[PDB]
Symmetry: D3
Subunit: 177 residues, 6 copies
């Protein structure tokens, strides 16, 4: 089976109010050893947010702002990009690359189950031993249509026909790990 | 209930396409149905939603002169794509969009596709002209009260600085009701 | 004449607004006329065209919760804005748009505003599905002929490498006509 | 009067074919001492393009590509952003900041008149001695409407009325250099 | 201490290197065994610059496309040259260098010797910025406010309200720069 | 010469500095008199990093908004720390450092001494990349192709077609890296 986000996520996830200071955030991250805090929703409809080590370094430290006067609402992402627990890790990897984030809460319904990061992916993903190309199932469909057309046009016993079907088979082998 | 939600302003006519379709098939569907975005069908329970938009097609195919009859949707779609909760307030959708630099997203609840929401939807149907509320003002109010409580403890409960800090709490609270009205 | 031009696919209904108007006035006009972009009127002969678009309004006003009744168009417009020649081929418009990361621009000839052209206009009305031509293929052909001429001079006019280099010139020239048809 | 692009542009502008090699481009730039070449339109409808020192350094030198095999069409901007000769330099400065370019051809109709750059602006603009805020005329209109409203509401002889008109006057003074 | 905290005082000292010719699988294996979010790429000779490959390079460039780490090589995804950090550089400057260049980690180099590796985590966990916040370029602000003050006093007189005001700006700033 | 051309061989040697506390007008005046597209910002002390302010900083951040250069200061628009260049660094690496960090000019620093200033123009006008083009990290490619070659020969025999093929890859690459 495809390895899922919830199988590699960090389960220790702490939350903080958006009204807290950045100093409060930094203290919590130091005590708990955390590179990201989830911002508590204030009510059922209110979205999840996140504040991360990079937010704090780029937006506070890099200008020399006083973390005791800045607040989490001034530097958090809210709404933040979120991850389904069933989502395959290769998709998380990609969501992360496309949106340029390194971590996200894992949410199922409106319940917070954990937090998943690039480090989680590097350290616990099966991607070295089971690399599987994204959208391969869509590739398989397309390569079958191509193969069917080449064989109709050039003949069932032509080198180009046999080549096109070989593509269908290398892909199907690749999709079954 | 009070804040206008994504589902109240989304476009409900949402069409999907397979990732294996050609870009030409995508363009034909968008022209027939008059659509600036197609949702890519999930292949199974776990598989995420994706999107292909007018800009994907123009920037990745038209601008190079690629043949839409040989490219496929999987070559230019975003998958996973950023998604929007139906309960999310429109001011938050506006912000999600600004932070992620997108102009449209599917509205998804659980794994069910309810619609599609865009910057146009926001411009044409949001209540932001008549009910403007600054984002996180409620968090500002909490912080200004903590600041005020600290300044009064430090400088004395009858000090000009104490009364000033509470006046900031009150200008903010006036601002938060003026618009909750 | 052969290549489909910007003016043949542009939207002709183009409305303008003053830079001094409020964002609320802009939003009202866009809603009445159903428009995703307003052109900002030049104040005099030399003054450039500007644009304010649905995204400017959503990203700069809605996403922060600013009051559109107190902000002004000059605070969120692009001026000068990128402009499009009416004679420009649509594949070039597609590319200008990709390189500059915009989705719409006024079509201007001299200082006269003829219309407005967008990615939607391109998606819905461009001939790129049926007449795909790779950009700068004609420049590729010239370069491949220079390469071919050099390889033949260096390795001999009857050499496999000479005949191969000219075969590249011919596959390209076949590709450039297949679509000029 | 507002200083215009054509008054500060470089008039020595050389062109090159898009089919030329990057080595040809580099040779021409070295002989003529130029940080940008205009790409010749091939016919009346064909847009102007540009290739600049940065294109060459970022796209060829930084990867170690052979300038003798790469071509100008592979690294040029075409269409390129263009400048009207009548456009005020403060607007050129801004067009440049918004589009993140440092140079553009000056075109009137379809005739190439010159080339204008950030250096041209730094060295020949009047911006140190006559800095003029962009869209001030639009600001003036808005400040008059504000002033008219405050005086109607609070009275013609109120401090807030006199303050609002003082804004109208500081702006009008600023717009006349 | 009262001095500005320096990069070398907060850097991670356990720094491992890899050749640019190694596979990404070799890189991933090393990072897993040693528990590391970044490897320094060995310079091949005196002139050759340092490089870096990081957890994000690997996830964004290899995992997210489904490339085979056993066939890709570190030279295909590393930054070389990479941005490098002086050991004497103040952490608030490292924070800024990081923001301006959009990186999250860099080698600490003195001459051509590798001393360690410094990251945003190092900054979050070990910087003194909570207890000693100092605005960037306040020292430059102080110099400018002194030049302004000197000029106003020369022009308007050394005992003038405007002179005393301008020096009061110099003093509020100097108080802000210390503690 | 045959060696890789270094930053110090193509840098501009006329390099002027300015304090961060100076006005942008002072900066503009200096750049006009000396004919310069960039000024180096003086470090205030041993630990303090180098900075830079460039023609683009001034045009994009001051001119384009209509700010008064007589009231703005260099610290409000400079990069500090700025990316810096070793004098021994090869120009193809400078070109790359520039692309990766999105800058067009940098100081050349050896230790804490300022030797000059190097820019994209310097690279365009004085680089040997037309006559000596070398692909970046080809040396790393060569190392990898030798490891591959060594393995194929150990596995399949030293006289096997596959062995001779793998070494032929090593030789085409080595020819490409020279002349
Ligand atoms: C309300 C103010 O008093 C602010 N308060 C800080 C606010 N936060 C979170 C929050 O209460 O929203 C920390 C919660 N904590 C215990 C608790 O209150 O539940 C702190 C106790 N005190 C005083 C008090 O609360 O009685 C410190 C000041
Ligand atoms: C610390 C701040 O609270 C200062 N406080 C002013 C000083 N005092 C009493 C005191 O608080 O020592 C006045 C009494 N009064 C109600 C009350 O305090 O019970 C004030 C109401 N507010 C808000 C609030 O009280 O929460 C104003 C701020
Ligand atoms: C056509 C080929 O011959 C290529 N040609 C290079 C092309 N360019 C520009 C161009 O001609 O499009 C340089 C022009 N120049 C004089 C001229 O031709 O007008 C070169 C002369 N020769 C031979 C020749 O042209 O007769 C060199 C090879
Ligand atoms: C240098 C290349 O031009 C080689 N050339 C092949 C060698 N020879 C003659 C020769 O060119 O020495 C064949 C004669 N023939 C027409 C002619 O050359 O006049 C070829 C047509 N083409 C294109 C072209 O000729 O422009 C093929 C390329
Ligand atoms: Yb079969
Ligand atoms: Yb179906
Ligand atoms: Yb329409
Ligand atoms: Yb690709
Ligand atoms: Yb109180
Ligand atoms: Yb206010
Ligand atoms: Yb009018
Ligand atoms: Yb519509
Ligand atoms: Yb502003
Ligand atoms: Yb010939
Ligand atoms: Yb082909
Ligand atoms: Yb009057
Ligand atoms: Yb860990
Ligand atoms: Yb030595
Ligand atoms: Yb050591
Ligand atoms: Yb650690
Ligand atoms: Yb002064
Ligand atoms: Yb004194
Ligand atoms: Yb010059
Ligand atoms: Yb020393
Ligand atoms: Yb000197
Ligand atoms: Yb020069
Ligand atoms: Yb192998
Ligand atoms: Yb041998």
């Amino acid at each position: 089976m495809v390895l899922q986000a919830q199988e590699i996520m960090t389960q220790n996830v702490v939350t903080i109010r958006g009204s807290a200071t950045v100093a409060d955030a930094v203290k919590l991250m130091k005590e708990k050893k955390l590179r990201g805090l989830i911002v508590e929703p204030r009510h059922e409809q209110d979205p999840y947010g996140i504040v991360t080590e990079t937010d704090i370094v780029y937006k506070v430290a890099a200008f020399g702002h006083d973390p005791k006067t800045m607040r989490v609402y001034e530097i958090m992402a809210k709404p933040c990009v979120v991850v389904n627990p069933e989502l395959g890790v290769e998709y998380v990897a990609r969501l992360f690359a496309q949106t340029r984030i390194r971590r996200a809460p894992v949410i199922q319904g409106k319940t917070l189950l954990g937090i998943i990061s690039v480090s989680d992916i590097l350290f616990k993903s099966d991607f070295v031993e089971k690399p599987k190309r994204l959208f391969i199932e869509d590739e398989i469909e397309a390569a079958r249509e191509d193969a069917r057309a080449i064989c109709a046009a050039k003949g069932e016993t032509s080198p180009d026909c046999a080549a096109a079907w070989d593509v269908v088979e290398e892909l199907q082998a690749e999709a079954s790990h």
